């Protein structure tokens, strides 16, 4: 094909940074290769930062854009999962994301928003509130939306890395039942 590559900014968290993966296995890297099958030569800027909240993304979006030698032709925004992991306000996550999208819109950079979904642990009230921020933002900022970015691995534990193992309340009870003898024995009489 003719021409310089198309520049795409992948602005996200550990799901874009490729946490736990080897060189070339992150989503941005594999997406760049896959877009050749759509007739597109892309250079995808991996602006994934592991652990970034929406507030962290807002803090760096201007710097990341000003750092680019070539202006992005599309920005993919994938943030909010770490807000959920911290149990942080969904409203504040929406506000922070709004500031990120507003900066991209000022610069006339098209936006694709990756929708995040809350697990049931924080409860239905929180989950509904969190989940709804993404359709709200896509409409308000005229962004395209992937409603559920992680949908293709939702039902596939075999496609999810084993790393953090946080017991449920019932799991804690199991740990206590297995280890209390050792604790009692270690405590001097």
Numbering used by the authors: 0 to 188
Structure paper excerpt:
Here, we reported the enzymatic characterizations and crystal structures of marine bacterial esterases CrmE10 and AlinE4. The SGNH-hydrolase family, a superfamily that includes the bacterial lipolytic enzyme GDSL family, consists of enzymes possessing four strictly conserved residues, Ser, Gly, Asn, and His, in four conserved blocks, I, II, III, and V, respectively.
AlinE4 had one molecule in an asymmetric unit and was consisted of 11 α-helices (including two 310-helices) and 5 predominant β-strands. For AlinE4, residues Ser13 and Asp162 on chain A and His165 on chain B were in a reasonable position of the catalytic triad, of which hydrogen bonds within the catalytic triad could be formed from Ser13-Oγ to His165-Nε2 and from His165-Nδ1 to Asp162-Oδ1. There was one density map around the catalytic sites in the crystal structure of AlinE4, which turned out to be one Cd2+ evidenced by electrochemistry analysis. According to the characterization of AlinE4, Cd2+ had negative impacts on the enzymatic activity of AlinE4, evidenced by only retaining 20% activity at 10 mM CdCl2. The results suggested that Cd2+ might act on activity through (i) blocking proton transfer and (ii) protecting substrates from nucleophile attack. The region of these five sites in CrmE10 formed a negative potential surface; however, the corresponding region was full of positive potential in AlinE4. AlinE4 displayed the highest activity (approximately 25.8 U/mg) toward p-NP butyrate (C4) at pH 7.5 and 40 °C (Km, Vmax and kcat of 0.10 mM, 26.9 µmol/mg/min and 25.8 s−1, respectively).
